[PDB]
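Q: I have eleven molecules that I believe assemble together. Could you output structure tokens for the complex as a whole instead of separate predictions?
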Amino acid sequence: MGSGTATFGKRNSTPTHIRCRRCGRVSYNVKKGYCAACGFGRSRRLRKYRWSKKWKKKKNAH
Amino acid sequence: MARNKPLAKKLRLAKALKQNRRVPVWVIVKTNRRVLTHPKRRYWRRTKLKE
Amino acid sequence: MNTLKMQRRIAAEILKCGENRIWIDPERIDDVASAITREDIKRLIKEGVIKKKPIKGQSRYRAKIRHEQKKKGRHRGPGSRKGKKTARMGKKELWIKTIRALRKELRKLKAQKKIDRKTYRMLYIRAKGGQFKNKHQLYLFLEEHGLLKK
Amino acid sequence: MGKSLIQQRRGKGSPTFKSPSHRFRGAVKYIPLNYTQEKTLRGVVEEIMHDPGRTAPVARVKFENGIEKLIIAPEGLLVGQEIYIGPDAPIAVGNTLPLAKIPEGTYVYNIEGIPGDGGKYVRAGGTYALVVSREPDKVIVQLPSGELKAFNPMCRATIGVVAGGGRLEKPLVKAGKAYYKYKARNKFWPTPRGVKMNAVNHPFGGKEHHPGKPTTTSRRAPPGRKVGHIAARRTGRRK
Amino acid sequence: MKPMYRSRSWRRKYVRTPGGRVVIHFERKKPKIAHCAMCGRPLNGIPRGRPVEMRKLPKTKKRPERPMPHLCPRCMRKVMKEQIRAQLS
RNA sequence: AAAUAGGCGGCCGUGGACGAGGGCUCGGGUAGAAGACCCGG
RNA sequence: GCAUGAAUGGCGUAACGAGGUCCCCGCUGUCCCCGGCCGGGGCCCGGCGAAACCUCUGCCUGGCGCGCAUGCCAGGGACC
RNA sequence: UAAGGUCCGGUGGAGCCGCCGGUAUCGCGGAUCCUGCCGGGAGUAGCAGCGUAGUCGGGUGAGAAUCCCGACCGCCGGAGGGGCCAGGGUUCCACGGCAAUGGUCGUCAGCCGUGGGUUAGUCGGUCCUAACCCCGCCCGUAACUCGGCGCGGGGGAAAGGGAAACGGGUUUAUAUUCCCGUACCGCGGGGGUAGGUGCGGCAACGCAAGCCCGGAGGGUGACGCCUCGGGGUAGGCGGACCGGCCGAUGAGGCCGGCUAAGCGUAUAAGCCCGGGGAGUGCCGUAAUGGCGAGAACCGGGUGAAAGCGCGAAUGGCCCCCCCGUUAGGGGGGUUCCGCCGAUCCCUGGGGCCCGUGAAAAGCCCUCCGGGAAUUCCGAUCCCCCGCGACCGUACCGAGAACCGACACAGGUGCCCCUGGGUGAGAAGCCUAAGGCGUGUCGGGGGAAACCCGGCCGAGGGAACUCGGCAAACUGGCCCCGUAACUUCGGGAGAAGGGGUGCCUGCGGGUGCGUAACCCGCAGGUCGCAGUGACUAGGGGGGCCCGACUGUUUAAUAAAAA
RNA sequence: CCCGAAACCGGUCGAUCUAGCCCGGGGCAGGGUGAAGUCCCUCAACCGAGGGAUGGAGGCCCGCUAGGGGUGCUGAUGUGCAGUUCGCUCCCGUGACCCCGGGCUAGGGGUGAAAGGCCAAUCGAGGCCGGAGAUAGCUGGUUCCCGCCGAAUCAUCCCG
RNA sequence: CCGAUAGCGAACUAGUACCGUGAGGGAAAGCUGAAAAGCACCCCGGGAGGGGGGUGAAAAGAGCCUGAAACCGGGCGGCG
RNA sequence: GGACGCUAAGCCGCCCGGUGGAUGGCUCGGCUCGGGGCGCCGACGAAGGGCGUGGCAAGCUGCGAUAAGCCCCGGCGAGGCGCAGGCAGCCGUCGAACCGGGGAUUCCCGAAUGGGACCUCCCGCGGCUUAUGCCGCACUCCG
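A: Yes, here they are, computed for all eleven components at once.
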């Protein structure tokens, strides 16, 4: 679409995800059951990647 | 309501409440020159705030 | 801090009145400033320092005069009104009145025994079709038929 | 080039092209838990109901095993009818028996495809099959199409016609009322014409009027090229 | 409140207080019928009111004397008429 | 302000002495966007 | 018919239209031909305070020149 | 020549060179270069435009046009106001401040600082199931945090369903909760009694409401649309009375006069029951219509709100007269009579249909009744003892607390749809209740030119212009009258004509006894003008296209698509 | 030597923007017109004819009700009040209507009453990171002095 | 080998502040003096600011070692 | 007529004060290399994360409601109480601070595992005891 979108919707209001407790990010999806910052509610592993994208952020965060 | 604050979230909010205080006097004497007040002071109109 | 807009707001809930109506003697603003309690405010109400003007309506005199005309069928007209058909009372609303009495009339005439069993059928079937307007009109139509005396 | 088309979306399970299955309450089986044979089973017409999902009349039948299941309603049905199943059922309207016991020349519906599955053919409202010919080898039945199919006489079927008709296809009148039918079913509607949909969306058309390729398409062509007249043997009706 | 929508269990009437302030108040269920479901007549005699309230309100307005209260008296006049017909023959 | 910067008449001088013209002031405009202009005091 | 034509629908059509085109009547400062009034500004004052962009200059006329110049060249005007 | 070096004087107050041989993240004028700092523009524009608010005394203070108090005047007025859903998170409240923040201003404040405020068996969340989702097991895939089937289990509604609570008081800030009154849910005990393992009435049916583990079954929970009529009362307004206030004239107005949730006793048209038996077949509604599976006509029974009492002479309003500088208080009286009109709330018919209209928790009955088995049993009937594992409650909810970086005129749901006049309106305008003057800069100037909204213009009547674009005009309402064409519906409010104020006397209609209303008529009569303001369509035909209603390039294109 | 653009491919993240579908709910003052059905009255032996009532339909009309859309002025604004605003005007306002909350559909895929429109200020194929310092015959730029010699802008081939 | 507009993004409460639905993206901020002796007491100032006086050096008096240029004010010398 | 008789505003250079943060010296940090070590741990409930905790605590650091800590041993041993050089106050020289090994407690969340869940909460067994205290248990192998 077309620039000028920010007066139309009172959005963000009520989320579409919530505060995790495996990482505390605001991505534990209440309409599924999946964490998209580290995996939880569908998973017993943390995400395992050699990108690094996550692994690096996490180490610095830790 | 506002909906809604579970038991742990009142604790978090409470941590957040503490930070919005200026640094007390006794610290600055103890350091012996000086510690500036330093941004963790909270507003309520201007504060939108990821979790 | 030297509000005093709050002091008024409290006196006003106790008096169960609006804030804008509470009157403070300008000479005794100093006495209301020192009072920081409801119990202090309640004393000041008794002393007259802090007072109530009660809530006020508006006058209906001029409405009473138009209404007096309007009840007599005067001060009206088709140049006096912007309402449409329903203001007049539309075709149902009138008819719902007329039939509901008309049936009571026929019933009255049966217990008076001014109509035999033979008349009744005709009167009922006639009543349904909107012949009458009403009290006068039933009286004329029956009299005419001359079955008021059978 | 182009993307998946309108039929290709349907198969995916897409929700615009998926039937509702919770305002639906249909299906008919004659209880194949006790096979085609065995008289053990009778029921009572409990009700004549509307089935919301087939938008058709249906009959509720209450079995003596104590099980409630639908059987597709006959014409002339009236509550308190007895339906019987087994070969020991009398030949009567709304009674169900195997083909062999059924004489030729009589209107029939709800015939089994493969013996013991409660019908796989003729389950439509107001539509009925006619028993033309009968042989103990194979029993030939005349379908709603007009095509004579051979069936094994161990298959169950019921005597009568199916109720209603003129009520499963009657004039749509206007767009509002037409719309109400497509919620009762699942068909993609309103749908525009391909001819002025782009050559990205649809193989035919451009922006202007003009086709792009001819309508009748090869049968051995891949998916995503079944547009126009699909598997046609001839086209049109005038020179 | 949580709903203010007008509803079938949140329909509301204005009520006076003692002081004559008048506050709006919430209602829940208002009388519903109880049906025979074996004839077009409801079962005569049986209270209307909310169905769970009926535990702790007469279970005896709910049993006029007769073995099954869930068959209407006219509907039971039929039902005897069969069992005895069956029995005579 | 025509640098050929003109003419005539009158008035004037002569942080730390004295002080002619002139404005600001006031009351109004024939005047007037600010200012100016003009007149009375 | 430069270069129409039957469902890559033709012809026509009541009713309908913030659709395109044209004509009339009424009406009217749109115009001949302009003026006055009303409110917010303008202008002035106190306080509050940016931006675009920024080699430099009081120019004009011709000629020249990458052929469309303040500055070269020859004229002309010039108190700030 | 130079790249570059050296010396002196001031500053500075601890490190620093030369020479030779090595080494490279080694020398800047430009990159619409990157970064920091700073000037011009300027003290200009902006702090005016939208429905446009302050002004005079007085208080405080270092300082007052915009802080507060008093008076006066506005704006908003079914909605720039009140309560809430989302969100925010302390913005709430209190006290002290003005460097910072508020489009100016500041002693003020949501800014700065520091304390303090949200207290729940009976409200809701939790719970139920819905659309629908996820997990384990099987299996697949080389494999997976991937994938769905077939089984098994869980989850899933802060606007659906649900066993169940109101009123008063108090606080600076809190309350359906704390406190006070009254009421009450569910389970577990006890003490009685219906229970003679239920008593009565010809009957419909009445209940101090059926002993009984188990499993089964059967009803109710439980659902789309739109008319018309029946009923309920919060509640809208006049008269009279009692106080209070306002008051040229002493008149008329305004204002307070109140009864909750919980219960008891009474509801009543549907719906059952008897009598009777439907005579040209009768009777009715607003209507469609009912009837031998029961008419006309007579009685009963039975299931909405309502009334009254309990609740409660309290309690709660409204004033008046005494104490009292004052703390802290005392005493009274009024607390009423009507009639009449609706939002809403519940109850009957009726039309509608190829959408024909979720489930469960929960209840109630019934079949069987284990056992105890009449020394029986039980407690839905009472009264009595004990309890409610858990989370929330502050404030705003918006032309400054949401969200748009922002105090950005934006733009987002519900309820207030019972305020008066007005009128067909949940309409306009005016005026209230209620809210605000932070729709956050002011003061001045014959105030010129010119611009943005906006008013009036003679004579002419589109000459202007692509084009009457833009504006003008009709106008509200009631009657009369209406053409071409036509799918007979429509075209149609075609076109075009006429009336409309106010006062005084009557009639019809509804009612009830002249109270409360609605709709017409006649006479008198003023102005330039009676929809006088506000509100408020110019009309007609021909041609082309697409039948229509709908939809499209959110944000140049709303169309012949 | 340094910088500078449009991209391609792999794996991730997004339907709080917006499209459509499902599920449970909400909202629409007031009026006109008056269908079908049905009755009555008059007139006619009947056939019917006329009037009146009753009844309320329509993807109907009117409307500052609430709400939705957004046509013209090519106005005001256009370093804005505003990264889409203001006023007036216009269309719709019981409907193929609007609207809330839950859930569902994801990248050569969806969704689309069909504009190549839309899918979180990005769509003729989304964003993120990795490959990666991609490649250029193409633009810009590349820093201290001095001394000596001092040009060619012609010729052949080449998807040049 | 580099040295605080460099070397890790980060020498100093740093992957912190902060932004974004999320994935993910991401800064700046080093130095008193030997010892704090970090300014008693006094005049003025509404004044907590600043100024006068007393402060070993204060031109070390509070992100205070050193203290460049652009730039601003006044003045001097020349021009006008 | 020429003369400095008064030439304002302003232009240019320099000077003085301010602004500014460049510059030099300074560096408890990076960066690279060489050598050695570390070389696994966890349902016997890990790592990671959250929220509290100090006299005053805003962050960091350390700990777990035994909360900038507790105990034991050996070693060094005469002042300490983290970053932080304030006051109050606290403890040791009759053995602290500190270092090494070992132990106690080690909240909630998290593989997290009984279930659900915005980092919280509720429960069904069995041991246990005054007892709810308190201890063990209910995902998947092998006996």
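A: One point stands out. The CA atoms of residues 19 and 40 of chain B lie 6 Å apart.
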